[PDB]
Design a protein around this ligand. Sequence first.
Ligand code: 8JL
Length: 136
Amino acid sequence: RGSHMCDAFVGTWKLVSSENFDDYMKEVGVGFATRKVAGMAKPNMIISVNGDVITIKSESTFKNTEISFILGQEFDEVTADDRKVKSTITLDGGVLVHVQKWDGKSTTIKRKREDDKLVVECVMKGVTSTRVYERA
Ligand SMILES: COc1ccc(S(=O)(=O)Nc2cc(C(=O)O)ccc2F)c2ccccc12
């Protein structure tokens, strides 16, 4: 197989900034103790592409997680904060758009490349958070 545009995401990334994530987590419904421990974490994110399958791994002192998915195809995800969600990830103009659905709720996480960074923007009921990763 040849190159794909989404190979721009591939690599090893480290969190360098996080803005408003506590208020986002409150809107998502994350409990106090999990918010405090999860907000401290400075994860590494490892993204790989193999054929049609994209794999996103996160490693941190809080939790290790791994999702593998095909664009546009719904999957089951257990999130780092222990929600059991239905997830669908698509590519819209270079941006990975990830919708998580659970318990009648929904949140959207966008991942995009900007300069040498990977920018993660999430939104829940009007509350947004921005988390920025750099190459590790
Ligand atoms: C480290 O505590 C977490 C790790 C991951 C998730 S999430 O469900 O994967 N969504 C997500 C991930 C990122 C990221 O990886 O930076 C940025 C914004 C997000 F909404 C969490 C979701 C809720 C609370 C804590 C989470």
